[PDB]
mmCIF file of C-alpha atoms in Angstrom:
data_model
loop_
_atom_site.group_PDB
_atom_site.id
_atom_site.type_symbol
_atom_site.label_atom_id
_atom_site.label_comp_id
_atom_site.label_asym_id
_atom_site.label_seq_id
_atom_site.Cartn_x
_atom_site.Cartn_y
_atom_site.Cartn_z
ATOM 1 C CA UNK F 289 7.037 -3.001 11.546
ATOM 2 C CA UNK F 290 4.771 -0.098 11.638
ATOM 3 C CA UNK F 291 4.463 3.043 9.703
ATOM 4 C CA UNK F 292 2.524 6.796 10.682
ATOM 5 C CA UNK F 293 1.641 9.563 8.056
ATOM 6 C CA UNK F 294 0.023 12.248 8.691
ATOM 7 C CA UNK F 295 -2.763 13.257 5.577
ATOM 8 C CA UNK F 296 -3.733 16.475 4.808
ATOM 9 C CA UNK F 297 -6.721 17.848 3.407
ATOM 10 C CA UNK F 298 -6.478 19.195 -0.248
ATOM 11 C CA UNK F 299 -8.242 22.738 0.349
ATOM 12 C CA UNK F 300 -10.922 24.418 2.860
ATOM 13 C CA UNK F 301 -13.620 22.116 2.344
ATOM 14 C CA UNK F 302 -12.225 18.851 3.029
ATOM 15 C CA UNK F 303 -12.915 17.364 -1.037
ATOM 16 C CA UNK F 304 -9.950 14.851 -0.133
ATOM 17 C CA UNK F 305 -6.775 14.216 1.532
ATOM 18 C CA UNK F 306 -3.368 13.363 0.644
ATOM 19 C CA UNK F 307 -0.618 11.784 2.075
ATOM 20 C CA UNK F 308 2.808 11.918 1.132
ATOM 21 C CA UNK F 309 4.310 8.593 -0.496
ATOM 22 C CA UNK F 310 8.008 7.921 -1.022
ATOM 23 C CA UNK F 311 8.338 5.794 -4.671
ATOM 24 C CA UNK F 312 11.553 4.645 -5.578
ATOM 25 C CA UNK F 313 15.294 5.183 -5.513
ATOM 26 C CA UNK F 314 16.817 7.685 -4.225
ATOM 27 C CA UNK F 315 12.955 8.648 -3.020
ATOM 28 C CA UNK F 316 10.220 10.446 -5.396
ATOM 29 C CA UNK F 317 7.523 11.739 -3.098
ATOM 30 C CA UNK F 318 4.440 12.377 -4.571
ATOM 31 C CA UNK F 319 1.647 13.210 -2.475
ATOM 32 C CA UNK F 320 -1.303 10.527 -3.286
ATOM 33 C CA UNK F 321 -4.926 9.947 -2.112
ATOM 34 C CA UNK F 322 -5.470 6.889 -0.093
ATOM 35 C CA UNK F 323 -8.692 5.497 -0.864
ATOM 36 C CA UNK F 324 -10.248 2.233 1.002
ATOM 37 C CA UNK F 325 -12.838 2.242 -1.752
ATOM 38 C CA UNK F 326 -10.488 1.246 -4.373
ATOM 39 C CA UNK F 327 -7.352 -1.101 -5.062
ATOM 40 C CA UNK F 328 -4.955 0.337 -7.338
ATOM 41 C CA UNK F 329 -2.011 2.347 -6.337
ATOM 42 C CA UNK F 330 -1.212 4.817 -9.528
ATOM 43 C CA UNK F 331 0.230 7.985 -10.089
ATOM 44 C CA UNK F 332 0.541 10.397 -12.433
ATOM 45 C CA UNK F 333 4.313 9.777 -14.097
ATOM 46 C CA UNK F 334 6.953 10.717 -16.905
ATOM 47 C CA UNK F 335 4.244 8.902 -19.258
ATOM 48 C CA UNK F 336 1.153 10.341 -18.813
ATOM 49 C CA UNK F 337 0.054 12.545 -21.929
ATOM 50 C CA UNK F 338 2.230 15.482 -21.571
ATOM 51 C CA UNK F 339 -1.474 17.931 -22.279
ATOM 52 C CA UNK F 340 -3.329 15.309 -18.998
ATOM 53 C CA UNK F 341 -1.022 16.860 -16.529
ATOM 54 C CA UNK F 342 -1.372 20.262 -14.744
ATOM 55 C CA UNK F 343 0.659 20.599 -11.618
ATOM 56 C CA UNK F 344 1.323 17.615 -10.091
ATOM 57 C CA UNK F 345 4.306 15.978 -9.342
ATOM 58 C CA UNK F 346 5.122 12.942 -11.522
ATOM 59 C CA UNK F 347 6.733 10.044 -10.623
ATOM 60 C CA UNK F 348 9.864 8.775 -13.419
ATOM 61 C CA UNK F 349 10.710 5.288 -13.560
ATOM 62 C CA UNK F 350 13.798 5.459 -15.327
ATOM 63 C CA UNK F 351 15.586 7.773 -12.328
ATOM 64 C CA UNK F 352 14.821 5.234 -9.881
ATOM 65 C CA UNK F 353 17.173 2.448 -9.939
ATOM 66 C CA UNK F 354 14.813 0.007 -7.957
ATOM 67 C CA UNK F 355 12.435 0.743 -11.406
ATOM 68 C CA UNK F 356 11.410 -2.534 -13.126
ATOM 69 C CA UNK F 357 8.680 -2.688 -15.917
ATOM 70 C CA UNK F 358 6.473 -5.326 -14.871
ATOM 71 C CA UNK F 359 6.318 -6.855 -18.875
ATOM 72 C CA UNK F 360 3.005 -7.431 -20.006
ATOM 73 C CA UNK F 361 1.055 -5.406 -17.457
ATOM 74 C CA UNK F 362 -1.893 -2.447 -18.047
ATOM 75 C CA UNK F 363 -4.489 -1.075 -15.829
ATOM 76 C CA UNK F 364 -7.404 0.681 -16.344
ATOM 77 C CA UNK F 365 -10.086 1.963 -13.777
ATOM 78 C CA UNK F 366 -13.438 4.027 -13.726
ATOM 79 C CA UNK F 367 -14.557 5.127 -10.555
ATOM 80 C CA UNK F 368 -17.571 5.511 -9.260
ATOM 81 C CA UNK F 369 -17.582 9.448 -10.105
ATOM 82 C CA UNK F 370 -17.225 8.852 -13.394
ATOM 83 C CA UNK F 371 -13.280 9.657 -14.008
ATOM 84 C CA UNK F 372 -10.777 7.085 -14.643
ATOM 85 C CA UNK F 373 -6.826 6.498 -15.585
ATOM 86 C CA UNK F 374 -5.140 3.485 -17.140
ATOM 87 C CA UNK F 375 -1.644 3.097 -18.116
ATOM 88 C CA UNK F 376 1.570 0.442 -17.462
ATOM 89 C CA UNK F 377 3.123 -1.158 -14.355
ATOM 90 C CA UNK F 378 6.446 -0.926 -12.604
ATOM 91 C CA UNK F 379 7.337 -2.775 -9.424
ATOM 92 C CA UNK F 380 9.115 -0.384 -7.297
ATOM 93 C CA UNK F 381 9.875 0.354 -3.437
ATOM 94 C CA UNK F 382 7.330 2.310 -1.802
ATOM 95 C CA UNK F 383 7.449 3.694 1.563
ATOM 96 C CA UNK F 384 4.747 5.297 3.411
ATOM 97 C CA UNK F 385 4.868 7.334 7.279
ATOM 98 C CA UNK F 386 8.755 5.112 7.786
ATOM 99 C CA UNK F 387 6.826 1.546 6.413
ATOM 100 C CA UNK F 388 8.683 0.159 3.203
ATOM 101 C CA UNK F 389 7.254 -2.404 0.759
ATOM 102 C CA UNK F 390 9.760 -3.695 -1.685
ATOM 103 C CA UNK F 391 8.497 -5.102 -5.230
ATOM 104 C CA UNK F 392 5.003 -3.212 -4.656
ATOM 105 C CA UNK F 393 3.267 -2.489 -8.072
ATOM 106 C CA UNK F 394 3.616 1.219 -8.982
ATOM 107 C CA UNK F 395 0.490 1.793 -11.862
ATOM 108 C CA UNK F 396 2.128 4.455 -14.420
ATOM 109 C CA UNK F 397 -0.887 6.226 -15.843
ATOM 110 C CA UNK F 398 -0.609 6.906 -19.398
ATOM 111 C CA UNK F 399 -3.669 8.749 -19.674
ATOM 112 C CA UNK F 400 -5.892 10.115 -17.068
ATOM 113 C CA UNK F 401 -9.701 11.911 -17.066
ATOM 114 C CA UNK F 402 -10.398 15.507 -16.596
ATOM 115 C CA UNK F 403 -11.073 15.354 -13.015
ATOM 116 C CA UNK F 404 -7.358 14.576 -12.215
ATOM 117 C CA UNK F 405 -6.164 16.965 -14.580
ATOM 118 C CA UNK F 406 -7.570 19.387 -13.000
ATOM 119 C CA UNK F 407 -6.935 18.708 -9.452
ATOM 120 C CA UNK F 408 -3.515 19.614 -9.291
ATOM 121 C CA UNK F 409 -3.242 18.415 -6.166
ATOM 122 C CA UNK F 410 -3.580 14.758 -5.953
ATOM 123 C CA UNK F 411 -0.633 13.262 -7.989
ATOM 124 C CA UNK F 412 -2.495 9.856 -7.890
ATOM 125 C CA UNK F 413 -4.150 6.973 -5.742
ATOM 126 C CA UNK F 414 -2.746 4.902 -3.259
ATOM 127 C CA UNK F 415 -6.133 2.177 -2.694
ATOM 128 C CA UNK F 416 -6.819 0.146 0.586
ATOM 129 C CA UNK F 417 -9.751 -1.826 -0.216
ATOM 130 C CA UNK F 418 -9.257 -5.911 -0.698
ATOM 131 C CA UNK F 419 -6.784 -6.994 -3.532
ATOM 132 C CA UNK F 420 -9.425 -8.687 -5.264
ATOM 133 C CA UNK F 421 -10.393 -5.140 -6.991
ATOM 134 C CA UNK F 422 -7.057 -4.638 -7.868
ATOM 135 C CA UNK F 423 -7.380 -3.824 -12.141
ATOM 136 C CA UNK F 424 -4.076 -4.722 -13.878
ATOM 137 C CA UNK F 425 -4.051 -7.642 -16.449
ATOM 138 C CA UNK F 426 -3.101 -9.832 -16.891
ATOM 139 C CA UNK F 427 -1.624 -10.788 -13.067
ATOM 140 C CA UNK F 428 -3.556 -9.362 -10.696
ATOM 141 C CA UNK F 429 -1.371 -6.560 -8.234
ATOM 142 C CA UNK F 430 -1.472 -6.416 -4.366
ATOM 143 C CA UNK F 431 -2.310 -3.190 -2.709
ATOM 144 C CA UNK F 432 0.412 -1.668 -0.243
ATOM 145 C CA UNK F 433 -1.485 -3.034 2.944
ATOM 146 C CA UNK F 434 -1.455 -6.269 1.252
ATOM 147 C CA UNK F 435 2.185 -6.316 0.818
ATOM 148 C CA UNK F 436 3.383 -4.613 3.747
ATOM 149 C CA UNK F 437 0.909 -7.208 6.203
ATOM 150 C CA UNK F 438 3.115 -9.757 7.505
ATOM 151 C CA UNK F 439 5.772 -7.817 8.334
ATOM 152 C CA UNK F 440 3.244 -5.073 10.422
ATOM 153 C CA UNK F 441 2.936 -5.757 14.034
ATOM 154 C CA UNK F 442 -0.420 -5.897 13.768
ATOM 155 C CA UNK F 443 -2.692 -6.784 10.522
ATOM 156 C CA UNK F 444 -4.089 -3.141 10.419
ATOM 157 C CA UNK F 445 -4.236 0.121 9.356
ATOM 158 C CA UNK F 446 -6.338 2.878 10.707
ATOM 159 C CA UNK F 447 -8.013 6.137 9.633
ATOM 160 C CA UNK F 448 -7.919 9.545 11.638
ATOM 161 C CA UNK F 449 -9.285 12.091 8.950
ATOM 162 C CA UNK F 450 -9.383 15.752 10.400
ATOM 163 C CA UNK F 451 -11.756 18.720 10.160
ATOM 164 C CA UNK F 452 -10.621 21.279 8.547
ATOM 165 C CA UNK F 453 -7.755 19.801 9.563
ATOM 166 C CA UNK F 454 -4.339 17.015 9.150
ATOM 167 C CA UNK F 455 -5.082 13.906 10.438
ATOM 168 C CA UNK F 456 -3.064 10.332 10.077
ATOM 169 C CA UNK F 457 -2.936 7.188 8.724
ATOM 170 C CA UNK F 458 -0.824 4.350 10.660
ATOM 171 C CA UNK F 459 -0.407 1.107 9.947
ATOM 172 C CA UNK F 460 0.403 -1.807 12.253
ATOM 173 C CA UNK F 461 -0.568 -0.609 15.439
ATOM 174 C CA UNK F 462 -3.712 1.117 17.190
ATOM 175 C CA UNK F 463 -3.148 4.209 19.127
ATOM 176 C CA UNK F 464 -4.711 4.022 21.904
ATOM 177 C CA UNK F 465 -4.326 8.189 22.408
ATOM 178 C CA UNK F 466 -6.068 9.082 19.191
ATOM 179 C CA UNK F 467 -9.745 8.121 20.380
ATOM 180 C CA UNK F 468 -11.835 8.597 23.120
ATOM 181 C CA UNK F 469 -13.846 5.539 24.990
ATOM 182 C CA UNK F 470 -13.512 2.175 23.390
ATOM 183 C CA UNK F 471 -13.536 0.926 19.869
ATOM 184 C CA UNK F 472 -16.282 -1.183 18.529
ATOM 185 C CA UNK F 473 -16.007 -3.692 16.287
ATOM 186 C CA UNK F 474 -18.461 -4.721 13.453
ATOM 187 C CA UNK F 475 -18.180 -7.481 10.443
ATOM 188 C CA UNK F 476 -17.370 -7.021 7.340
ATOM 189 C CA UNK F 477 -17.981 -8.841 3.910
ATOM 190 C CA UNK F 478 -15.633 -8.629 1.306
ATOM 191 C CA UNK F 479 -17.937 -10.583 -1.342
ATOM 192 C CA UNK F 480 -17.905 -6.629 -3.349
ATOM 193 C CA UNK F 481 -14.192 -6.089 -2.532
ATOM 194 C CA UNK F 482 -14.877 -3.419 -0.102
ATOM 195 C CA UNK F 483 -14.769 -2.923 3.711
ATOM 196 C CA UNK F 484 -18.502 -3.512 3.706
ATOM 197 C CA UNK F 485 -20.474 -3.589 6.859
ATOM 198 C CA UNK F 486 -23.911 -2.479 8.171
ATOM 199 C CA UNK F 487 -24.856 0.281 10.435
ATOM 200 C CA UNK F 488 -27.713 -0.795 13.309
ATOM 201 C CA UNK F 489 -29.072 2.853 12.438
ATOM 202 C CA UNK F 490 -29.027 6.601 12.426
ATOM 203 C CA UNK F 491 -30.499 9.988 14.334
ATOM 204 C CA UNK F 492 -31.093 13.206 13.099
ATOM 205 C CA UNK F 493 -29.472 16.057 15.272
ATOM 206 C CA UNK F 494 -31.409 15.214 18.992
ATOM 207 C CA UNK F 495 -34.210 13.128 17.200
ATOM 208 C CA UNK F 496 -34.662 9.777 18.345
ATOM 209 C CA UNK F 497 -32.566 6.589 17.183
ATOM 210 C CA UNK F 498 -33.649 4.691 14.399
ATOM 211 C CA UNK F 499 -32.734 1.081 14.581
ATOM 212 C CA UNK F 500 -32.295 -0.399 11.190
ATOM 213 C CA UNK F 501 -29.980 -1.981 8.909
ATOM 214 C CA UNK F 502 -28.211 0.188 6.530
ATOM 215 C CA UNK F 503 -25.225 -1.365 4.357
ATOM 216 C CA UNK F 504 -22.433 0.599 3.439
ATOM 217 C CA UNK F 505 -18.885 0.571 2.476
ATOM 218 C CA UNK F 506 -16.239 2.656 4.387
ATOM 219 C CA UNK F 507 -14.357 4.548 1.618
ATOM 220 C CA UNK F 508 -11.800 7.609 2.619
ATOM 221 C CA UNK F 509 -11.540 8.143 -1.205
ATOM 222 C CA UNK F 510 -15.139 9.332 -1.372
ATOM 223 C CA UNK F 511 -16.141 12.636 0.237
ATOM 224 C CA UNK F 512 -19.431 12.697 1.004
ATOM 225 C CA UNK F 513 -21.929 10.601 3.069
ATOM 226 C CA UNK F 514 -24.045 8.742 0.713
ATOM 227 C CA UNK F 515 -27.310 6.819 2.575
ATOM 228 C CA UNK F 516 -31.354 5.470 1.139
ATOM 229 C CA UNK F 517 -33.028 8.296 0.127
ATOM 230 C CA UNK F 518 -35.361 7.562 3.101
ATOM 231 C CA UNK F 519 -32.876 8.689 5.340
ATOM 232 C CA UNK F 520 -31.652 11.781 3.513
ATOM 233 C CA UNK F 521 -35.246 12.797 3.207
ATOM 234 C CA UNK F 522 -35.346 13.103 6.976
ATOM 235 C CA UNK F 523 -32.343 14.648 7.571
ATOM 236 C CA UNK F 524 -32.672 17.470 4.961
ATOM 237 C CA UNK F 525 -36.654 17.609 6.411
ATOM 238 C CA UNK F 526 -34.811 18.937 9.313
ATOM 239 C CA UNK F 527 -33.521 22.117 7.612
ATOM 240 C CA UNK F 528 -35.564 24.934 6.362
ATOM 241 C CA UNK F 529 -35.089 25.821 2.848
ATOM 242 C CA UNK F 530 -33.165 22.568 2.262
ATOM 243 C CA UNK F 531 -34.093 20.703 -1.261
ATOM 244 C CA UNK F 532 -32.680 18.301 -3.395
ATOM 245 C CA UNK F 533 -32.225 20.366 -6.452
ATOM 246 C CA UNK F 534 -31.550 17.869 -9.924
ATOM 247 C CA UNK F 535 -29.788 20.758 -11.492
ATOM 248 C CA UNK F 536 -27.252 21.232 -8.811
ATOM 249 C CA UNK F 537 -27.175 17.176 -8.644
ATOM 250 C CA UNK F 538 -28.396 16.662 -5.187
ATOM 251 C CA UNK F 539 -29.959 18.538 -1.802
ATOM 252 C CA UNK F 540 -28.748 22.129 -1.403
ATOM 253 C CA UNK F 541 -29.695 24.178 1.675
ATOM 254 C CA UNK F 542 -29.329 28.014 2.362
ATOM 255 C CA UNK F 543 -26.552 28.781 3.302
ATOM 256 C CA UNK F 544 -27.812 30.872 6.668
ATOM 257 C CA UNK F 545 -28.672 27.356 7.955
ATOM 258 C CA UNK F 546 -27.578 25.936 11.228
ATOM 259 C CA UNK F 547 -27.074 21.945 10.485
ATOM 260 C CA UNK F 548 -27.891 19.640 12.803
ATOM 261 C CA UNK F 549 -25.786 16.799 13.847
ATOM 262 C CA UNK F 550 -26.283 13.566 11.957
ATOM 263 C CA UNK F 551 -25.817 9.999 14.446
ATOM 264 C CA UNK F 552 -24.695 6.383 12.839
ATOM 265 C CA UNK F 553 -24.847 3.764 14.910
ATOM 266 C CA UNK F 554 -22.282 0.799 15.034
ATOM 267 C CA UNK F 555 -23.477 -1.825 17.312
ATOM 268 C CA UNK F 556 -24.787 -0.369 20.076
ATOM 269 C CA UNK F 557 -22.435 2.604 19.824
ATOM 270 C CA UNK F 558 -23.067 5.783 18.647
ATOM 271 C CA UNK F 559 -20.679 7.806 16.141
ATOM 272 C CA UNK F 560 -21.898 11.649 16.076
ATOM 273 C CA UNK F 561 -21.176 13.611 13.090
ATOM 274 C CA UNK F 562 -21.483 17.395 13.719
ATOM 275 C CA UNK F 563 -23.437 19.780 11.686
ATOM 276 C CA UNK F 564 -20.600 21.733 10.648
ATOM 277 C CA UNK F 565 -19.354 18.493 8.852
ATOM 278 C CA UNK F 566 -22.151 18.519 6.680
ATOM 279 C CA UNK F 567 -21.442 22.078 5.244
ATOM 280 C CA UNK F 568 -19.904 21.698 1.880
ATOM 281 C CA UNK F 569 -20.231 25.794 0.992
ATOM 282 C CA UNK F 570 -21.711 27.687 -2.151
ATOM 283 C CA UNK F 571 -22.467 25.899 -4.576
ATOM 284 C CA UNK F 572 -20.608 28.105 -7.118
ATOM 285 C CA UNK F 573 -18.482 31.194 -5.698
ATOM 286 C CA UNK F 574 -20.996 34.260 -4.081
ATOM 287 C CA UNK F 575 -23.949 31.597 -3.796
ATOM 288 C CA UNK F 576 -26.166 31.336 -0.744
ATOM 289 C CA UNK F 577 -27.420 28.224 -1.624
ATOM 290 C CA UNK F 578 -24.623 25.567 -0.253
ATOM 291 C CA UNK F 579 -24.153 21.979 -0.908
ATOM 292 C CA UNK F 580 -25.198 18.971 1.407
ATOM 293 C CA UNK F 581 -22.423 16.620 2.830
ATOM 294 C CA UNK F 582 -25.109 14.018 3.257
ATOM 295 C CA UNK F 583 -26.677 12.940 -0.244
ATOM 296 C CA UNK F 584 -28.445 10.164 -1.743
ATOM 297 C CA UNK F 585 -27.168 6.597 -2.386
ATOM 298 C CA UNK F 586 -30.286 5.854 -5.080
ATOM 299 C CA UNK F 587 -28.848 5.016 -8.314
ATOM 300 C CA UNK F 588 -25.204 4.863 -7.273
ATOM 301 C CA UNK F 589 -26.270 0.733 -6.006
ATOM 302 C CA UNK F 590 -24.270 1.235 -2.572
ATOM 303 C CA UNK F 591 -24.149 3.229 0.066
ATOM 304 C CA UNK F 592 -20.867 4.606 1.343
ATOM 305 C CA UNK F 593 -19.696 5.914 4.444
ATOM 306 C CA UNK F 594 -17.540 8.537 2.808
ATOM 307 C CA UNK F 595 -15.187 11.376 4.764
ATOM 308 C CA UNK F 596 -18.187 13.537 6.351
ATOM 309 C CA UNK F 597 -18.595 9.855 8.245
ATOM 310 C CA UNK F 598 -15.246 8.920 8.378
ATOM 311 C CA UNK F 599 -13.840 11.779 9.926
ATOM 312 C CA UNK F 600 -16.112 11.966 13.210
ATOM 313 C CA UNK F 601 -14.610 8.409 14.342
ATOM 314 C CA UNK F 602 -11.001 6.740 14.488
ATOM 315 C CA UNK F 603 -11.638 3.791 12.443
ATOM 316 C CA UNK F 604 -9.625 0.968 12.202
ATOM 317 C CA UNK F 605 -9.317 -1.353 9.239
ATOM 318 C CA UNK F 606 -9.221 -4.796 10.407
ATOM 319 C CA UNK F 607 -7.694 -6.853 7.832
ATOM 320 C CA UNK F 608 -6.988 -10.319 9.972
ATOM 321 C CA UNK F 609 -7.868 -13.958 8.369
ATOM 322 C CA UNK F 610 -11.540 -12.472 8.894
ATOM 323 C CA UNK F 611 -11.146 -8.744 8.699
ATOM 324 C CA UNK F 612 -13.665 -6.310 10.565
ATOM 325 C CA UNK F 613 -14.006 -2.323 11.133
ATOM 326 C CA UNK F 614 -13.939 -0.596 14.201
ATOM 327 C CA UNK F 615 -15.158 2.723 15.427
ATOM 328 C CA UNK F 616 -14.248 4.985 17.888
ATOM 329 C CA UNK F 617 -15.491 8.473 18.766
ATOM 330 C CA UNK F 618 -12.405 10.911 19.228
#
């Protein structure tokens, strides 16, 4: 089997994506972020504290008659922007882009943080990293890739954010038309639970390559590119007026400036990640100081390869006996 859905960003600057997800019977579609970083698929629901939700579309067990309360289980997650959700467990059937998983554990949020509130659009997660991160107690749950693996034609899925624009997610096959030149490969380690691997490097705009080791997860549920603070240092260098600014909470540039391009290497292949990627607007409505898509990992312990990476490549998520990541330019 194989499955294709097409993810859409949730306004002009690109904060995050959704995809449509069909939950239950006959189908609930709510419209969920897919996020490699994490392992729990949840969604806002007819439980969640009635004052928690603002806009989204809630998913309701008791309408779908493939609804079973998976006794005993809770879940309860903090990411690593500081917002979290926790709640009960159904099993339920879950489709995504024409791929069906039957008996996959839907995470009913009872209560949810601020930042979903608020974000009307995202009616919950749907996560992609390894089931090992996976938070409800007491039987660990299998994400959706898990579940749907041996019956994909391939053991993959594959990422194909836009700019400024849709983009898909398929699983079970690569397509071959969605990238230019060939994909490479790199290892990962899932020791952390992510899809960890390391870089060979980077380049400021038409600066010389710098070959050195730099490991990162690959996370389409983070936005931003998030490297040492060596490296951030000499990109921003590059950028008149550019500083990292503690009351904003990171480096802010004016917003007059032409970026330049910012170059991550993957094995001896290049992924280029235009300027224009790296422009995430005023800092508060009318400003001319705008926000950096490339910020520092110091003090969040990891670096991540966010969407501002992500969404320069086609990226496919390996997960065979030993998984590994590959990039292509498109």
């Amino acid at each position: 089997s194989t499955g294709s859905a097409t993810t859409t960003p949730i306004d002009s600057l690109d904060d995050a994506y959704i995809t449509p997800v069909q939950i239950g019977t006959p189908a609930q579609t709510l419209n969920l972020d897919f996020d490699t970083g994490s392992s729990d698929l949840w969604v806002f629901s007819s439980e969640t504290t009635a004052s928690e939700v603002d806009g989204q579309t809630i998913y309701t067990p008791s309408k779908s008659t493939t609804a079973k309360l998976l006794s005993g289980a809770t879940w309860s997650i903090s990411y690593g922007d500081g917002s979290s959700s926790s709640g009960d467990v159904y099993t339920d059937t879950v489709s995504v882009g024409g791929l069906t998983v039957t008996g996959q554990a839907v995470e009913s949020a009872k209560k949810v943080s601020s930042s979903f509130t608020e974000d009307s659009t995202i009616d919950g997660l749907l996560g992609l990293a390894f089931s090992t991160l996976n938070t409800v107690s007491p039987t660990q749950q299998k994400t959706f890739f898990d579940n749907a693996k041996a019956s994909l034609d391939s053991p993959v899925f594959t990422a194909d954010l836009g700019y400024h624009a849709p983009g898909t997610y398929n699983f079970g096959f690569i397509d071959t038309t969605a990238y230019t030149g060939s994909i490479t490969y790199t290892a990962v380690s899932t020791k952390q639970g992510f899809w960890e691997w390391t870089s060979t490097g980077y380049a400021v705009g038409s600066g010389t390559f710098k070959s050195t080791s730099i490991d990162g997860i690959a996370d389409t549920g983070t936005t931003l590119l998030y490297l040492p603070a060596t490296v951030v240092s000499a990109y921003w260098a590059q950028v008149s007026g550019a500083k990292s600014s503690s009351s904003v909470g990171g480096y802010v540039f004016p917003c007059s400036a032409t970026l330049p391009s910012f170059t991550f290497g993957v094995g001896s292949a290049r992924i280029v990640i235009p300027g224009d990627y790296i422009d995430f607007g005023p800092i508060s409505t009318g400003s001319s100081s705008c926000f950096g898509g490339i910020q520092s990992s110091a003090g969040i312990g990891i670096n991540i390869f966010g969407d501002v990476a992500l969404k320069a490549a086609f990226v496919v998520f390996n997960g065979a006996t030993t998984p590994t990541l590959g990039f292509a330019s498109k």
